[PDB]
RNA sequence: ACGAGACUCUGGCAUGCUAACUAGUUACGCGACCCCGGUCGGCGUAACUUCUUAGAGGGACAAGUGGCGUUCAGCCACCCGAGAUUGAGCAAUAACAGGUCUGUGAUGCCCUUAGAUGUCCGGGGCUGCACGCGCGCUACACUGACUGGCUCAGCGUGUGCCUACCCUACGCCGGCAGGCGCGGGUAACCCGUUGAACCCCAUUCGUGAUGGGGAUCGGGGAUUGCAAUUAUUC
């Protein structure tokens, strides 16, 4: 019964939509789904030099890449929420089913 | 206590600012008489917020100079504590009163400026700043490569500078500037 | 709403050139230039060297 | 320095041109009028032009106008 | 510049003068009786503790870096 | 996956694949 | 003979073993998050891998 | 009977202390140890300023225990003194009449705003071409 | 008692070097070339000598053990890692090579290097830097 | 009542160091003359019987936060390796000398072992620390 | 029409708002000692989000008052308050014969191509040392050094397609640098409650080129590597 829908994405709005879609949309089937938990945002920073050569003032680019992770938890067998997850998915959001 | 907020174990009242000029720019009294020099800060946000800062805190901050001592305010409050306990044993007076007279009898009343070198008058806030700065620098040099510790040199500076005893680094720099200002007045 | 074509490199000589073709509206500054302005850069090998083609 | 740009003023002026009778003195009541009567995609710009709508409103009761 | 040579343990004359002057002073710290007995701050850190045992000079406050002693109370 | 590539590398791996 | 003189000098580490996955150039390499990309090529392909400039 | 529990947090920098104030007989315990034995003791009087401004009759029947984390030796003391002060004013706002709460708020705000209203300042981002935020390396000419 | 003791020895020639006996006992022996800061504390921790006073108050016959500790290390439970001379190409024995002994062993292992004409030996013979430093911008005031 | 957190910790290790000198059943090793107490140290520990202050220390560190292993105790005894000419660093402490404290306090049953890995405090050593602060409490009354 | 601005990120607050065995807190049963009571980052749990994480909305405008401003535009104060000028990013027109052909399987032309300027292997060299410059690090000590004792961080990284080189707990042996079993973690789960330094508290040292300073230099022990000498580091 311990199934976690693990929603990880880079964009915030596609992740809020898809997570709310399995909470707001998963209202009128009387499911026992527990509220949304947000893991701390993993901010991947790579600081390179702008210049191809070594010439001029030392200017650096600071490329960031914020990636987010969210948990959906419920006490029911597999196909009762594979009905829910299979419909209206996003390329941007990666969703992994942990049945155990 | 509503009786009196005693500065660790020191007096608030009976600390007269006996000069009728510097009475505004000396914070020792009534609204700024606290248990310690150490404050939150935020006196260096505006122009004339720095004057209302208590002088125990001004002399505390002035004492941490020359690179190695930078941002050691817990060391300097302890230097102030020791050099304040020393003055009461050596003088027989409230160290705040001896400090007040030391700041007042150290601040130079005139200075010279390139307009060519012409003598001008000095602001009372610069008088407080230069008085504090010259006293701390005199204490700083006096305890360098010497067995005499910083609190012993700081107390000897503030007793000599309260008296106008002429052995002060601060008084000798003050008498120099006022004479050199008078040279082209 | 507007566009900008810049064709840079060799245009008859040993002293480089860049022909600029502006029209209408064009933003350079601000964050809007991520989703408003569509930019492309190509090389092209004509027999005297390489011409660079910059479309906005 | 807090000078409002021409963008703020020539949006505020036409907000009073169309909807003068709805407006009042205090900033908060007619910031909420600026919600519906103006499409603004920036809440700092919204509060900037709302703030000028009140200042232009206060000087209307003294007498004449810019235009 | 000018060398300052000191005593590592007390002479008769040094132990004589610190018995008859150092209890009769107001500011009794090791850095003052290092100046005027021409001894070390180390030898004063034994001398002022040896006068604490004799019970002539009273301590004010003891910090790691600095300790202070004073003359007697009269009454 | 057996080597089980982490979340900070999965976004990278799809990114470089797209490029 | 010369087939003991191709890569018989063992290649198990160093700057000669690894290079950028676009050019095969041995300098300014980024191994952080398993890019294996030269700083010039990364700054070119920053936008389209997913990296953004915000600060 | 009905619990008169109040939880009030405070902060100076990334240091943050939250004082749970309860209806008791007098108890101030910082992470289990009391006010007298939290070092430094040179900055103990900055912890006594909530007490001696108000006395021990504002701290008559309150048991204010603290839990502190983050920051440093000075900032954690500034988090404590703020939190236990705010915490008493919050307990005396809800469960006692607000007239006496205003009488206390007068003294605590008039003494230092930090005792009630926190410091907004944090540390700055380091910009390249220099070691700190607003400092650059040595510009060598020639 | 507390005053300067009689039978006072200010200078104390211990393995022919005039030790100034006005210093704490561990830091007084450091003048001897082969005992530093570390060796002295251990060789006076082995034999019970109180580390509270100078070398002026100690007995002349009580330091008979001291030289035999300082000269013979391993005999009084001193560990083998503690010794400066360890497993020498010439003798093989572990020692503490002291004032004149050390000076001889330096030139012995320098002549050993120089006479076989190893690269390490010649930079010692020419007064160059032996452990591969950059001598482009160092050695200005000591030279010429 | 009094416990260990209600006394100044700066005199508790000294008071408990005096107590374990009175007991004298601790099983002390035989390198106390020569050993240097971490890689960042310059001199030897100046206390002639220095081992009797750290056995007094470690039990306090196990009383407050239990589960302090060998590597965790070396992490606690860390200092500034002043590297002469180059910039300084943090230096994690020496293993064996602090491992021969938690081996020395294993023999005399005052610290113990449990699950999760690591040493911890035996339910008798809690009492044996409570009645050291008992003397320290009324030494400042 | 562009640039400035507006914009995006970040910081400050929110007892109000949304949600949490990969965050806690309060209360409760149990367990330990405790001289009716304290501490517990000791075990387990029925509420709740003050602390934590990141969502959505609010919040701040020269808005209120007072002057000055012909006088609009505005300026300076003061109240109220979490802020009454946070910090970055982005960034026009026109140029410089700046720098890069040693980032490119982007590159015209010139020169090479089995006499190699292609390609790999074995060694050396970029470090060589009478000198001259620039960026740095440690200091010249007593506001200090050495030795003990005490109490708190926040940004990140991690088992790599190539790809081994991860991070490391716990317990033994070793003075130490290290070695050996036995785990945990593809990570708000483990290292980790990241017990960081300085500062604070107590000891010795005493103006001496001293226990300031630690360059050069002799001897010995492991680690990485196929290989350390011109010494990898420790």
Structure tokens at J100: 């021969």
Cβ–Cβ contact E16 with I under 8 A: no
Q: Do E11 and I3 touch (CB under 8 A)?
A: yes
State the Cα angle at B69 between E40 and H69, rounded to 5°: 115
Enumerate domains of chain I plus CATH numbers: 2-79 (1.10.8.50), 80-144 (no CATH)
Q: Do J138 and J130 meet the contact criterion of CB atoms below 8 Å apart?
A: no
DSSP chain B: --S---SSSS-SSS----SSSTTSS---STTS--S-S-----SSSSSTTSSSS-HHHHHHHHT--SSTTTT-HHHHHHHHHHHHHHHHHHTSS-HHHHHHHHHHTTS-SEEEEE--EEEEE--HHHHHHHHHHHHHHHHHHHTTTSSS-HHHHHHHHHHHHHHT-S--HHHHHHHHHHHHHHTT-
Whether H contacts J, i.e. 3 or more CB pairs less than 8 A apart, is: yes
Determine the Cα–Cα distance for residues B76 and B37; give it in Å rounded to an integer: 10
What CATH code is assigned to A1-100?
3.30.70.600
Domain that residue H35 falls in: 1-142
Instruction: Of B123, B161, B164, B130, give the one whose Cα is nearest residue B24.
Output: B123
Structure tokens at E20: 């008859």
Alpha helices in chain J (DSSP H): 9-23, 51-64, 70-76, 96-102, 104-107, 125-137
Work out how many CB contacts closer than 8 A connect B with H: 29
The DSSP letter of residue D61 is T
Compute chain H's Rg from CA coordinates. 19
Instruction: Of B36, B170, B151, B34, give the one whose Cα is nearest residue B103.
Output: B170
Work out how many CB contacts closer than 8 A connect A with H: 5
Enumerate domains of chain E plus CATH numbers: 4-73 (1.10.10.10)
Instruction: Of I99, I97, I101, give the one whose Cα is nearest residue I15.
Output: I99
Structure tokens at C4: 């900008």
Q: Is G38 annotated as a binding residue?
A: yes
Distance of CA H61 to the CA centre of its chain: 20
Structure tokens at B162: 């309260």
Query: Which distant-in-sequence residues (6+ apart) come within 8 Å of B152 by Cβ?
Result: B83, B86, B143, E27, E29, E31, E32
Q: What are phi and psi of I106, to 5 degrees?
A: -55, -55
Residues 11-70 of H with CB under 7 A from strand K: 11, 14-16, 18, 20, 22, 27, 29, 31-32, 39-42, 65, 67, 69-70
3-class SS string, E49-66: HHHHHHCCCEEEEECCCC
Method used for this model? Answer: cryo-EM
What CATH code is assigned to B6-183?
1.10.455.10
Nearest chain H Cα distance for residue A60, angstroms: 7
Compute chain J's Rg from CA coordinates. 16
Cβ–Cβ contact A58 with H under 8 A: yes
Determine the Cα–Cα distance for residues I58 and A98; give it in Å rounded to an integer: 80
Residues of F in contact with A65 (CB under 8 A): 11
Q: Is G42 annotated as a binding residue?
A: no
CATH code of the domain containing D10: 1.10.60.20
Question: At how many Å resolution was this determined?
Answer: 3.2
Question: Do the bridges between strand E58-62 and strand E67-70 make them parallel or antiparallel, or are there none, so unpaired?
Answer: antiparallel
Structure tokens at A18: 């898809």
H133 touches strand K (CB under 7 A): yes
Instruction: Of B77, B68, B63, B28, give the one whose Cα is nearest residue B153.
Output: B63
Domain that residue G53 falls in: 3-55
Structure tokens at J89: 């660093």
CATH code of the domain containing H25: 3.30.230.10
Whether residue D31 lies inside any domain: the answer is: yes
Residues of H in contact with J5 (CB under 8 A): 32-33, 37
Structure tokens at C8: 């840079």
Q: Is G46 annotated as a binding residue?
A: no
Whether I contacts H, i.e. 3 or more CB pairs less than 8 A apart, is: no
Determine the Cα–Cα distance for residues J121 and J111; give it in Å rounded to an integer: 4
H65: left (phi over 0), alpha (psi -120 to 50) or beta: beta
Taking the CA of residue A71 and the C1' sugar atom of nucleotide K187, their distance in angstroms comes to 15
Determine the Cα–Cα distance for residues C46 and J7; give it in Å rounded to an integer: 87
Whether residue D22 lies inside any domain: the answer is: yes
3-state SS class at A63: strand
The DSSP letter of residue H1 is -
Residues of G in contact with A41 (CB under 8 A): none
Determine the Cα–Cα distance for residues J136 and J141; give it in Å rounded to an integer: 9
Number of domains comprising chain G: 1
Nearest chain B Cα distance for residue E13, angstroms: 22
Q: What are phi and psi of J41, to 5 degrees?
A: -80, 155
**Structural domain boundaries in chain A:** 1-100
CATH code of the domain containing G20: 4.10.830.10
Whether residue D38 lies inside any domain: the answer is: yes
Cis status of the peptide bond prior to H40, with omega within 30 of 0: yes
Determine the Cα–Cα distance for residues B72 and H40; give it in Å rounded to an integer: 13
Determine the Cα–Cα distance for residues B75 and H19; give it in Å rounded to an integer: 29
The DSSP letter of residue E39 is B
Domain that residue D38 falls in: 6-61
Residues of J in contact with H37 (CB under 8 A): 5-9
Per 3-state DSSP, what percentage of chain E is helix, strand, and coil (rounded to 5)?
30, 15, 50
């Amino acid at each position: 019964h311990r199934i976690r829908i693990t929603l990880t994405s880079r964009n915030v709005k596609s992740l809020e939509k898809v997570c709310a879609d399995l909470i707001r949309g998963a209202k009128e089937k009387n499911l026992k789904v527990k509220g949304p938990v947000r893991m701390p945002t993993k901010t991947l920073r790579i600081t390179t030099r702008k210049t191809p050569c070594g010439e001029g003032s030392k200017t650096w680019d600071r490329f960031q890449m914020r990636i987010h992770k969210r948990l959906i938890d419920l006490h029911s067998p597999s196909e009762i929420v594979k009905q829910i997850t299979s419909i209206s998915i996003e390329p941007g959001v990666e969703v992994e089913v942990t049945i155990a | 206590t509503p009786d009196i907020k005693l500065f660790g174990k020191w007096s608030t009242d009976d600390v007269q600012i006996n000069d009728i000029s510097l009475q505004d720019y000396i914070a020792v009294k009534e609204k700024y008489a606290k248990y310690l020099p150490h404050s939150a800060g935020r006196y260096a946000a505006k122009r004339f917020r720095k004057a209302q800062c208590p002088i125990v805190e001004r002399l505390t901050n002035s004492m941490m100079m020359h690179g190695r001592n930078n941002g050691k305010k817990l060391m300097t409050v302890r230097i102030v504590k020791h050099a304040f306990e020393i003055i009461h044993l050596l003088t027989g007076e409230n160290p705040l009163q001896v400090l007040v007279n030391a700041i007042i009898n150290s601040g130079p009343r005139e200075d010279s400026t390139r307009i060519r070198r012409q003598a001008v008058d000095v602001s009372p806030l610069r008088r407080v700043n230069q008085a504090i700065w010259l006293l701390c620098t005199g204490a700083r040099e006096a305890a360098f490569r010497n067995i005499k510790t910083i609190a012993e040199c700081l107390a000897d500076e503030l007793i000599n500078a309260a008296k106008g005893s002429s052995n002060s680094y601060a008084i000798k720099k003050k008498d120099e500037l006022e004479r050199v200002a008078k040279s082209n007045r | 709403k507007g566009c900008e074509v810049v064709v840079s490199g060799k245009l008859r000589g040993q002293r480089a050139k860049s022909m600029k073709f502006v029209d209408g509206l064009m933003i350079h500054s601000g964050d809007p230039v991520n989703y408003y302005v569509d930019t492309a850069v190509r090389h092209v090998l004509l027999r005297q060297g390489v011409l660079g083609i910059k479309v906005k | 320095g807090r000078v409002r740009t021409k963008t703020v003023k020539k949006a505020a002026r036409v907000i009073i041109e169309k909807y003068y009778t709805r407006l009042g003195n205090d900033f908060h009541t007619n910031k909420r009028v600026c919600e519906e009567i103006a499409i603004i995609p920036s809440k700092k710009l919204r509060n900037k032009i709302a703030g000028y709508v009140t200042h232009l409103m206060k000087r209307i009761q003294r007498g004449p106008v810019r235009g | 510049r000018d060398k300052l040579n000191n005593l590592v343990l007390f002479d008769k004359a040094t132990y004589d003068k610190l018995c008859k002057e150092v209890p009769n002073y107001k500011l009794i710290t090791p850095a003052v009786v290092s100046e005027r007995l021409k001894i070390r701050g180390s030898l004063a850190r034994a001398a002022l503790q040896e006068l604490l045992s004799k019970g002539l000079i009273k301590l004010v406050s003891k910090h790691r870096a600095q300790v202070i002693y004073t003359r007697n109370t009269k009454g | 996956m057996a080597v089980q590539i982490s979340k900070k590398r999965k976004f990278v791996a799809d990114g470089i694949f797209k490029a | 003979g010369h087939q003991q003189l191709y890569w018989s000098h063992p290649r198990k580490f160093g700057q000669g073993s690894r290079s950028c996955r676009v050019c095969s150039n041995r300098h300014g390499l980024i191994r952080k998050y398993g890019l294996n990309m030269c700083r010039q090529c990364f700054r070119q392909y920053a936008k389209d891998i997913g990296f953004i400039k915000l600060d | 009977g009905p619990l008169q529990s109040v939880q009030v947090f405070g902060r100076k920098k990334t240091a943050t202390a939250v004082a749970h104030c309860k209806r008791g007989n007098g108890l101030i315990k910082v992470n289990g140890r009391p006010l007298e034995m939290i070092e430094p003791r040179t900055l103990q009087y900055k912890l006594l300023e909530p007490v001696l401004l108000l006395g021990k009759e504002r701290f008559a029947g309150v048991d204010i225990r603290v839990r502190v984390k983050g920051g440093g030796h000075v900032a954690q003391i500034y988090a404590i003194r703020q939190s236990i002060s705010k915490a008493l004013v919050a307990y005396y706002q809800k469960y006692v009449d607000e007239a006496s709460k205003k009488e206390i708020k007068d003294i605590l705000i008039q003494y230092d705003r930090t005792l009630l209203v926190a410091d907004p300042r944090r540390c700055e981002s380091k910009k390249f071409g220099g070691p700190g935020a607003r400092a650059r390396y040595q510009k060598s000419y020639r | 008692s507390l005053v300067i003791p009689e039978k006072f020895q200010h200078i104390l020639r211990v393995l022919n070097t005039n030790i100034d006996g006005r210093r704490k006992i561990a830091f007084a022996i450091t003048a001897i070339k082969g005992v530093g800061r570390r060796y002295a504390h251990v060789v006076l921790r082995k034999a019970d000598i109180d580390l509270t006073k100078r070398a002026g108050e100690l007995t002349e016959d009580e330091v008979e053990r001291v030289i035999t500790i300082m000269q013979n290390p391993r005999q009084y439970k001193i560990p083998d890692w503690f010794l400066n001379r360890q497993k020498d190409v010439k003798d093989g024995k572990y020692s503490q090579v002291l004032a004149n002994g050390l000076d001889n062993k330096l030139r012995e292992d320098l002549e050993r290097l120089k006479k076989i004409r190893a690269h390490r030996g010649l930079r010692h013979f020419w007064g160059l830097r032996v452990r591969g430093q950059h001598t482009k911008t160092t050695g200005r005031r000591g030279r010429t | 009542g009094v416990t260990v957190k209600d006394v100044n910790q700066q005199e508790f290790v000294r008071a408990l160091a005096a107590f374990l000198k009175k007991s004298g059943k601790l099983k002390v090793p035989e390198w106390v003359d020569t050993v240097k107490l971490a890689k960042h140290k310059e001199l030897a520990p100046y206390d002639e019987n220095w081992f009797y202050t750290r056995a007094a220390s470690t039990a306090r560190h196990l009383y407050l936060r239990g589960g302090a292993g060998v590597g965790s105790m070396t992490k606690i005894y860390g200092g500034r390796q002043r590297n002469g000419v180059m910039p300084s660093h943090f230096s994690r402490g020496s293993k064996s000398v602090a491992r021969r404290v938690l081996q020395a306090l294993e023999g005399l049953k005052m610290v113990e072992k449990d699950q999760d890995w690591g040493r911890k405090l035996t339910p008798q050593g809690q009492r044996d620390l409570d009645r050291i602060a008992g003397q320290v409490a009324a030494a400042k009354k």
